[PDB]
Amino acid sequence: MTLCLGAITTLFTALCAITQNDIKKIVAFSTSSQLGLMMVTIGINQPHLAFLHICMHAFFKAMLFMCSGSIIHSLNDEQDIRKMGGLYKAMPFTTTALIIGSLALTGMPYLTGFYSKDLIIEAVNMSYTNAWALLMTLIATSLTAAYSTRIIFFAFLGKPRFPPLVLINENNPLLINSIKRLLIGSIFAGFIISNNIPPMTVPNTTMPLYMKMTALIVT
Amino acid sequence: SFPKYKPSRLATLPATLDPAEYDISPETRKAQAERLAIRSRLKREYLLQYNDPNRLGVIEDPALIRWTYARSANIYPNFRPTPKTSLLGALFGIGPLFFWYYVFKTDRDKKEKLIQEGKLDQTFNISY
Amino acid sequence: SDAPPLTLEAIKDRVLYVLKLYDKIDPEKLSVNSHFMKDLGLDSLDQVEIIMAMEDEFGFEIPDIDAEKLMCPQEIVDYIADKKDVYE
Amino acid sequence: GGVHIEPRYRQFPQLTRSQLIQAEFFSATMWFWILWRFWHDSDAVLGHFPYPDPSQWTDEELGILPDDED
Amino acid sequence: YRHSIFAVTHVLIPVWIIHYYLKYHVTAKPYTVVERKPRIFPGDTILETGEVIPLMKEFPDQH
Amino acid sequence: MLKIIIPTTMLLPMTWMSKHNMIWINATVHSLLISLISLSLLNQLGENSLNFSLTFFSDSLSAPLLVLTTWLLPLMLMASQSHLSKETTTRKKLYITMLILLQLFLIMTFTATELILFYILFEATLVPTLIIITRWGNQTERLNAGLYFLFYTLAGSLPLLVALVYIQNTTGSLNFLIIHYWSHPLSNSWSNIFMWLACIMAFMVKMPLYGLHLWLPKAHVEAPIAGSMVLAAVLLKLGGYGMMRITTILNPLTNYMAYPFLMLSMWGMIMTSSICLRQTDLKSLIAYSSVSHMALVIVAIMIQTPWSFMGATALMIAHGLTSSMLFCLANTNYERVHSRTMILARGLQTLLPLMATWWLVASLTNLALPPSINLIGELFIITASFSWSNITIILMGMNMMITALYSLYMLITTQRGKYTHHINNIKPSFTRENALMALHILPLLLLTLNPKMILGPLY
Amino acid sequence: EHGHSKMELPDYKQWKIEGTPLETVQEKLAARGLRDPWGRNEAWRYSGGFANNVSFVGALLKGFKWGFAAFVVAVGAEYYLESQ
Amino acid sequence: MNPFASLTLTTLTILTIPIMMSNSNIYKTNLYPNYVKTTVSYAFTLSLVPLLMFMHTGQEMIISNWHWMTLQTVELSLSFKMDYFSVMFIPVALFVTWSIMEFSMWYMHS
Amino acid sequence: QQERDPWYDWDHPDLRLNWGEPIHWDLDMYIRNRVDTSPTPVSWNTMCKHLFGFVAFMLFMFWVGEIYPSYQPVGPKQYPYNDLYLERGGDPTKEPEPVVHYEI
Amino acid sequence: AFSAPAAYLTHQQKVLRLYKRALRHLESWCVHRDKYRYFACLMRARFDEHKNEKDMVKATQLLRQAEEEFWYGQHPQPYIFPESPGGTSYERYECYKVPEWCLDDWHPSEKAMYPDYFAKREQWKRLRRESWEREVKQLQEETPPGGPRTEALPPARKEGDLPPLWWHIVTRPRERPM
Amino acid sequence: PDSWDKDVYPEPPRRTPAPAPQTSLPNPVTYLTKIFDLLVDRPVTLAREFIEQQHAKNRYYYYHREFRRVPDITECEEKDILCMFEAEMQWRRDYKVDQEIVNIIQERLKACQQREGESYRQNCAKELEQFTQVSKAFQDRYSDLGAHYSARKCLAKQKQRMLAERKAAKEAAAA
Amino acid sequence: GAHLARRYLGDASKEPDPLRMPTFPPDYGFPERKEREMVATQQEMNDAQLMLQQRDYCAHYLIQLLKCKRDSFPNFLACKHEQHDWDYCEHLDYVKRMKEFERERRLLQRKKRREQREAEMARG
Ligand SMILES: CCCCCCCC/C=C\CCCCCCCC(=O)O[C@H](COC(=O)CCCCCCC/C=C/CCCCCCCC)COP(=O)(O)OCCN
Ligand SMILES: CCCCCCCCCCCC(=O)SCCNC(=O)CCNC(=O)[C@H](O)C(C)(C)COP(=O)(O)O
């Protein structure tokens, strides 16, 4: 029951996130899908892996919400991504923090999200479980990559779409320091924590080569 | 042509899709005019009572008094025992009680039968 | 927030700036008091487009009942100032 | 606690050199970390122990007789 | 200076109170603070007894 | 026990011989002193009881109720001080006399070694309450309300008297100690069934049981604030105390005679809760919440298990304090607005922030937020009911959810949103009202530290 | 301490439709006998620092050059130290 | 003795001092957000020690310090579990909270 | 009450009511904090059909996946001491049927 | 909001409202500015083709099929300005709005601060007290028998007069009081 | 600590490993614990010694109350109220002591589970069996009596249990 | 997977059920049947208190790795040799499981072929 509930939650919430226009709503649906993945991990009898994913998600999702809040405040309390255009150069620190957080969220290798999400996918691929739940989890991973792409493309890449009076500003030490601490965390904490904790479950040493790369392929 | 919108109780019809507003007759215009007239008279009365520097209290609303009185104290004098009221009262006030009685009586009979037969395994069940 | 306290001069400057970018209007002809239908020879749909452009410029929207009776730049500026509580 | 930056009205906002340098430094740090980890730990992505082919195993080690003994 | 006073009144005093309460009142009763038994690996030695755990069976090591 | 009874009686000549402008001060000070004296009753034993004399005894079921009764009087005086300002001195003294008389009867009733003395005092409490409701009530419905509050009660309790005297003709005694030590099983007979009904329904009607609860919204809405407080806090608990006392002689009939009432409660706690969702009066909403809570207490008493009794005692105390606080907050709004309608005065948190804090704390307590004693009682009753039958949880769970809803509904309609524009006579809250709220709420949070004092004799 | 520095608006003649996709919109409209009356109002969105874009792949590789150089230097140092 | 329990309880206890001072004068000044942020950072740095001690050895404790009540054969006491999950999630939550509070000093300035 | 005009100058802007106008019998049911009847872009019946179809399809597919699971081409995991008899429950005074693991 | 509503909307007003709504939802669909300009010119061309129609019946038959088409393709999540009745900050600052009469209940120690402000307040109070008595008679004489047909108020016509019912429009709290 | 009996609350010998450092890097845990000792444990020890000497300057005693045994409910006449009162009080005291015995065994079980850690299912087996025996005895004695329990009801329950056992034994022997 | 496709789209009886595997005696293939070996004893495995699911045939390498991680604490990447040994032993365990699966599949194949040949001979 836990596995099925988690799978349907992650698929449904990623599907909802795939087409939202409020930035906060997109990040909230991403949070819900990650929670569904955590419940899927619990269902396949891997509690320590779920706790590790909790720890990594904390870092990178909190940084993502801080970057969204920075954009919202700088654009005069505007939250719709239809009305934010070219911010890649207009505010570069939020851009780089958001890119790094999106890469960690999508399980880019050797980042904080790698050490949890990659192991989750490998564990669900090699267990006596539902086929439907496995397929839903894979589609959810693809949709995670897809909605991260949506956020970046509609918030940073195009031409500006905000009102003419430009009040863009990042130069506040409080914002920069608060974001950069969790940036360093979302780069290194996965490696540090994974190397520091004792082993709590049997590893998946030998897997088919196509099955080892499935998370990267779907992403 | 485009697929039609079907209104429901919890999703009503848009005002812009009402055929009634496209059938305009002088009587409809006069009705709208007198509706606005009574609305404006009420608004003028309220705004006269509202901007008064001398007033230092609550502006009593007869509409609110009528609403509360009709909801609370006007029910019984207008109640009439009919087949509909009798049947609905009997159902909504008796059915749940007997349904729940059957449920709990059956469950406790099964539990007591199991206890008497000795096959319940009440180990560690100290606090009751 | 960190939003500058906009003044009536700024509102008038921005309104005239938006109106001068409307190529249907000759920048020489129009003034603050220039009426839209008579002095400038504009249509009603042109007026609603002007109101939408003002809404986009200032980041807030004007209700249709109030918008439909804004016929001069001066009263547009006055409406914005009254809405934003800008005395000066 | 920041510095004074004025609005621009339809022009690109004023940028501080410090924020540009910090952002570029952190991006370069991320990419260097990824490349370093891939150089030193390449098996965390590609695996270390090869997957055997079951059909390639001979019938001797699988306890298979030539279809007549039992 | 403010950081010194903050570290004194907000960390040192509470840690003093809690350590006193734990060391002299909480532990006066049995089973109030129960500790997970430390792990013993082959080859280790105990401070209390001094005995040495014998090593393992010499597994045949290769690769 | 006379160390509490005699000062309560001396409150009367103290009141009548007081100066015209010093009655409230004297009454409040000496009521608080009497409450401080009454606090000493809380020292109880795990053995039988505190048998002071042949007439009066005290237990750990009686002690919290006595302390609550003594504590309520100063609060009732503080809340009554306001609306009786333009009254003559004699009528103010008469009002205070009615309150003192009610307290004296209540104190004696809770000790009451004998059952017919308990009946006499448990009925004597009816006259001061009736005079309070029908003399100092504001609306014209008070008279009708009083009639209901009277006749319902008597209709339930005239048979009980008969049962009681009949019991003394067969047992030979109505002393509770002898009644407990010489108890015998009740055989399953029609006469025994009707004796059970006569013994039970008198306390059933005062809880109130669902279906017999029609007097309560009338009496609580139409009464003055002190009357509402004493009705919601203490007078409802007389039925629970009496049921706890008298169920010792009704076994094993209670094993199956309890089925009609348990259902009436378990389903009823739903209905009344749902009623609170659509209510345009604040007092009516608080009254229906009281009905729901006492329905859960009824289920606890009928289940007849140790956890049930502990939870029931805790819930009686918690509900008394919470309902008194909520009635006081509603009255503070009413004395400003004069309407008693929830939808009319809105957005009051902006205008009165500290009173909004009091409203939030009261709503949280009524919602049964842990570790408040409200949740302790509710959780003990829920666990006992789950042991009784694993299906009850469904109904119980539903009630919990619904409770939260209407509680926060009351908090959001009155305190949040935009203020009503035309109401401009909302003065800042007086020190008297804030002190009343604080003295209501602080004992609850202090009692959460020592719950064993309100968990009954079965702790 | 707030932003009171009397910011001045640029000159409205600065904004021209030329060199922007609004020009292509105008050609496609004139192919049907239509014209854009508000075209110059949005030209500022393609004129200044907003005139140049970055691809998604380029956005993801924001600092790959410096990072790769540092990685090469560090791995060379590791090779020159381990081989000792 | 065994600094594990003292340090773990010290984090949780010093997280509550600003709530006690919310009725003091600092709550009426503009230094309160900085006060809370500094308290949270100090608590995080303090909690970083039991994590190190668990990482080195694997220290795990149960602290039942205050006995609330006893319903016959059931004893309810104030008990804290300081296992791997607790001592790993406390530093992460405190770190993220410190960052969020420093961000909020800027976001909620008006 | 949600579908009343939000741009009118009501006497009670939060409740969207005018002083003196008749009040609907069920005003507290429609107060913008509760059930609203605003028209939707998609019809109610279509919405119900689509949502119920999605939920039923998901439930059926989960049941199918339960019938037809997914696994790997491996045998059961082997544990040395009689499938860890003593460390899983125990009962050291019954001498169970010992189990032996086949080395291949 | 400020303007008094009329008894009905004419055909011209309904057409204009449809045009504005369709333009807004088209802008929501076409995110990029140049694409929006292209399709907005297309929409305007489609809109003014029937500008010169003379009969009422077929003009009313249009703007009906038009509204049906709008409802079918209405972008179920349109863009909303943050302060609009559906925006993310619609009533954000209404909890900071306090009436002016609350200042009448301040303690004298609180009114000791800000003496100039409260002196100006007393001047405003006196002005309101006189102008109200003038305004009542003005509105009594001006209004038609049987009450007011529409909820529009007249201006002041004399030298020292103030517009009737002005106190609660002039003394609004603010848009962002804190 | 002498404050409690070691036989009532048993504990294992608590063997602990000895530090065997395999690298030359200094671990921060030892430095942090030495700093904790110097900055926390010494002032706390000094304060405790001061308070303890202050207590030693004024020493007094309290005693555990002893209760005589009285005849139980099985030897009371039908209506003899005084003997019933004494027996009821004695039965209530016995019930409280039995509750506390069950509490002690529960504490033993709980402490052991935490101490054992991973091998609690095998290691804590002795503790589990004791709890089962005590729970069975307590449940037989005091279950289903109700809120209005008394010595007479417990006696009646025991009488009916003995009757059932006697009937079963007779039917088994005569089988 | 291909085995899922073979079992669920082809013949179920042709391939083993993982729940009831193995269905054939260990001595059916060859009578040698060498026994597996355990290096870690019961008591030291209990003292290290690894996990119930970690107390498998590779537990000596896990004990060595835990001794490593405890001894060289600050250097959290000191001995990667022991991690490699534990991973290699677990790899060998998994390949043994795969071999068991394949043996059962081939034994089922030959049993079904025997049944078919016997049926054909009886038909003739
Ligand atoms: C809020 C409204 C509630 C009103 C009260 C409802 C409860 C009514 C209780 C029954 C009334 C009778 C009281 C009897 C007092 C107890 C005495 C007793 O039980 O002794 C019985 C006597 O029992 C009776 O006589 C009972 C006769 C009942 C007559 C009165 C009927 C009143 C209505 C009864 C039905 C309604 C009860 C439930 C009410 C439901 C809600 C309104 C034995 O008498 P003996 O002859 O000495 O012994 C027999 C061996 N030789
Ligand atoms: C994406 C959503 C889909 C959108 C679909 C919408 C479909 C719209 C197409 C419908 C075509 C029509 O207009 S339907 C045609 C309606 N009938 C008429 O237009 C006849 C007279 N027109 C007027 O009077 C007007 O107001 C006018 C003169 C234009 C203004 O006047 P001014 O300015 O001087 O005031």
Q: DSSP string spanning chain A?
A: -HHHHHHHHHHHHHHHHTT--BHHHHHHHHHHHHHHHHHHHHHTT-HHHHHHHHHHHHHHHHHHHHHHHHHHHHTTS--BGGG----TTTSHHHHHHHHHHHHHHTT-TTSTTIIIIIHHHHHHHTSSB-HHHHHHHHHHHHHHHHHHHHHHIIIIIS---S-SS-------HHHHHHHHHHHHHHHHHHHHHHHHSPP-S-------HHHHSHHHHH-
Amino acid at the residue L80: K
> J25-49: buried (b, 16+ CB within 10 Å) or exposed (e) per residue?
bbbbbbbebbebbbbbbeebeebee
Structure tokens that stand for J119 in this block: 């002196």
CB F273 within 8 A of CB F282: no
Rounded CA gap, A213 and D51, in Å?
14
Phi, psi of H63, deg, nearest 5? -120, 100
Does residue E60 have a cis bond before it (omega within 30 degrees)? Answer: no
SS3 annotation, F414-459: HHCCCCCCCCCCCCCCCHHHHHHHHHHHHHHHHHCCCHHHHCCCCC
Q: Which residues contact F144 (CB under 8 A, 6 or more apart)?
A: F218
CB L115 within 8 A of CB I86: no
CA-CA-CA-CA torsion sign (F362, F367, F369, F371): positive
SS3 annotation, I9-58: CCCECCCCECCCCCCCCCHHHCCCCCCCCCCCCCCHHHHHHHHHHHHHHH
CB J31 within 8 A of CB A154: yes
Using the beta-carbon criterion (under 8 Å), do I45 and B8 form an inter-chain contact? yes
Structure tokens that stand for F429 in this block: 């809250």
CB F406 within 8 A of CB F276: yes
Structure tokens that stand for A106 in this block: 């999508």
3-state SS, residue D2: coil
- Chain H hits for A198, Cβ within 8 Å: 58
I-L CB pairs within 8 A amount to: 67
Rounded CA gap, D39 and D50, in Å?
20
Does residue L22 have a cis bond before it (omega within 30 degrees)? Answer: yes
Structure tokens that stand for A145 in this block: 């990559």
DSSP codes joined into one string, L2-71? -HHHHHHHS-GGGS--TTT---S-TTSS-S--PBP---S-HHHHHHHT--TTT-STTHHHHHHHHHHHHH
φ/ψ bin of L103: left (φ > 0), alpha (ψ from -120 to 50), beta (otherwise): alpha
Task: Please name the chains neighbouring J, where neighbouring means 3+ C-beta pairs under 8 angstroms.
Answer: A, B, C, F, G, I
- Chain D hits for A97, Cβ within 8 Å: 26
Closest partner residue to D62 (CB to CB) among L87, L91, L103 is: L103
Taking the Cβ of residue L18 and every Cβ of chain I, the question of whether any pair is shorter than 8 Å is answered with: yes
* Strands annotated E in F235-277: none
Query: How many residues in total does chain B contain?
Result: 128
Atom of ligand 2 minimally distant from the CA of J18: 6
Q: Decide whether any atom of ligand 2 lies within 6 Å of the J19 Cβ.
A: no
Q: Would you state the torsion angle of the CA atoms of residues F324, F326, F328, F331, taken in this order, to the nearest 10 degrees? A: -140
> H68-87: buried (b, 16+ CB within 10 Å) or exposed (e) per residue?
eeebbbebeeebeebebeeb
What is the Rg, in whole angstroms, of the alpha carbon atoms belonging to chain F? 21
Bridge partner list, K17: E46
Bridge partner list, G74: none
Q: How far is I71 from chain D (nearest CA, A)?
A: 16
Structure tokens that stand for G72 in this block: 């090469």
Q: Which residues contact E15 (CB under 8 A, 6 or more apart)?
A: H6, H7, H10, K40
- D56 DSSP assignment: G
φ/ψ bin of H72: left (φ > 0), alpha (ψ from -120 to 50), beta (otherwise): left
Structure tokens that stand for K151 in this block: 């010595």
Structure tokens that stand for F361 in this block: 């704390």
Evaluate whether residue C3 is within a structural domain: no
CB atoms within 10 A of CB B113: 11
SS3 annotation, chain B: CCCCCCCCCCCCCCHHHCHHHHCCCHHHHHHHHHHHHHHHHHHHHHHHHHCCCCCCCCCCCHHHHHHHHHHHCCCHHHCCCCHHHHHHHHHHHHHHHHHHHHHHHHHHHHHHHHHHHCCCCCCCCCCC
- E46 DSSP assignment: B
Using the beta-carbon criterion (under 8 Å), do F47 and K92 form an inter-chain contact? yes
CB atoms within 10 A of CB A134: 22
* Sheet strands side by side (includes E33-35): E33-35, H61-71, H74-81
Structure tokens that stand for H52 in this block: 């190190």
Q: What is the resolution of this structure in A?
A: 3.0
* Residue of J138, J144, J142, J141 lying closest to J166 (CA atoms): J138
Distances (CA, A) of I96 to I90, K119, L40: 10, 20, 22
Amino acid at the residue K159: K
Tell me the CA–centroid distance for residue A145 and ligand 1, in Å.
76
CB F345 within 8 A of CB F414: yes
* Residue of A20, D11, F171 lying closest to G44 (CA atoms): D11
CB A42 within 8 A of CB A50: yes
3-state SS, residue F51: strand
The continuous run of DSSP H or E covering H79 comes out as strand H74-81
Amino acid at the residue K133: Q
CB D43 within 8 A of CB A113: no
Evaluate whether residue C2 is within a structural domain: no
Structure tokens that stand for C21 in this block: 């970018």
* Residue of A52, A55, A56, A59 lying closest to A182 (CA atoms): A59
Distance of CA B103 to the CA centre of its chain: 30
Half-sphere exposure of E51 (CA within 13 A, CB side): 5
Rounded CA gap, F80 and F215, in Å?
23
CB J97 within 8 A of CB B30: no
Using the beta-carbon criterion (under 8 Å), do F389 and B50 form an inter-chain contact? no
Evaluate whether residue C57 is within a structural domain: yes
- Chain K hits for F247, Cβ within 8 Å: 147-148
Q: Ligand 2 pocket: which of J10, J12, J25 to mutate (most atoms <8 Å of CB)? A: J12
CB J178 within 8 A of CB J96: yes
3-state SS, residue E52: strand
CATH code, domain carrying C33 = 1.10.1200.10
- H62 DSSP assignment: E
3-state SS, residue H76: strand
CA-CA-CA-CA torsion sign (K148, K153, K158, K163): negative
Rounded CA gap, F49 and F176, in Å?
11
Rounded CA gap, J44 and F456, in Å?
80
Burial class for I43, CB neighbours closer than 10 Å (0-12, 13-18, 19+): middle
Terminal CA-CA length for chain K:
58
Taking the Cβ of residue F418 and every Cβ of chain J, the question of whether any pair is shorter than 8 Å is answered with: yes
Rounded CA gap, K46 and D47, in Å?
59
CA-CA-CA-CA torsion sign (I7, I9, I15, I21): negative
Q: Decide whether any atom of ligand 2 lies within 6 Å of the J54 Cβ.
A: no
Structure tokens that stand for A152 in this block: 């970046």
Tell me the CA–centroid distance for residue F190 and ligand 1, in Å.
9
- D7 DSSP assignment: -
Structure tokens that stand for K60 in this block: 């007094």
* Residue of F234, F230, F206, F223 lying closest to F133 (CA atoms): F223
Bridge partner list, E35: H61
What is the Rg, in whole angstroms, of the alpha carbon atoms belonging to chain D? 31
- Confirm whether C13 is a catalytic residue: no
The continuous run of DSSP H or E covering H74 comes out as strand H74-81
Taking the Cβ of residue G66 and every Cβ of chain A, the question of whether any pair is shorter than 8 Å is answered with: no
Rounded CA gap, L20 and K83, in Å?
69
Rounded CA gap, K148 and F245, in Å?
10
Distances (CA, A) of L72 to A189, D64, H59, H99, I66: 20, 49, 16, 32, 46
Using the beta-carbon criterion (under 8 Å), do I73 and D62 form an inter-chain contact? no
SS3 annotation, chain K: CCCCCCCCCCCCCCCCECCCCCCCCCCHHHHHHHHHHHHHHHHHHHHHHHHHHHHHCCCCCCCCCCCCCCCCHHHCCCCCHHHHHHHHHHHHHHHHHHHHHHHHHHHHHHHHHHHHHHHHHHHCHHHHHHHHHHHHHHHHHHCCCCCCCCHHHHHHHHHHHHHHHHHHHHHHHCC
Q: What angle do CA A104, A109, A112 make, to 5 degrees?
A: 40
CB J92 within 8 A of CB C1: no
Distances (CA, A) of D45 to A99, A216, B6, F140: 21, 9, 55, 84
Distances (CA, A) of F69 to B109, F34, F219, F230, K15: 42, 11, 20, 8, 59
CB G44 within 8 A of CB D10: yes
Rounded CA gap, K136 and B125, in Å?
9
Rounded CA gap, I32 and I36, in Å?
7
Using the beta-carbon criterion (under 8 Å), do G46 and A159 form an inter-chain contact? yes
* Residue of A109, A143, A108, A147 lying closest to A20 (CA atoms): A147
- Total number of domains constituting chain C: 1
Q: What is the β-pairing status of strands E33-35 and H61-71? A: antiparallel
> D34-61: buried (b, 16+ CB within 10 Å) or exposed (e) per residue?
bbbbeeeeeeeeebebebeebeebeeee
Using the beta-carbon criterion (under 8 Å), do K121 and I86 form an inter-chain contact? no
Evaluate whether residue C59 is within a structural domain: yes
Residues with CB under 6 Å of ligand 1 are F 152, 155-156, 159, 162-163, 166, 191, 194-195, 197-198, 201, 205, 212
Burial class for K3, CB neighbours closer than 10 Å (0-12, 13-18, 19+): exposed
Closest partner residue to K117 (CB to CB) among L49, L72, L75 is: L49
Bridge partner list, L35: I102
Rounded CA gap, F424 and F404, in Å?
32
State the residue range of the domain holding C58.
Answer: 8-84
* Residue of F331, F395, F405 lying closest to F367 (CA atoms): F405
Evaluate whether residue C52 is within a structural domain: yes
* Residue of A74, A140, A152 lying closest to A107 (CA atoms): A140
Distance of CA F8 to the CA centre of its chain: 20
Q: Would you state the torsion angle of the CA atoms of residues D34, D36, D37, D40, taken in this order, to the nearest 10 degrees? A: 160
CB H76 within 8 A of CB H22: no
Ligand nearest to C-alpha J44: 2
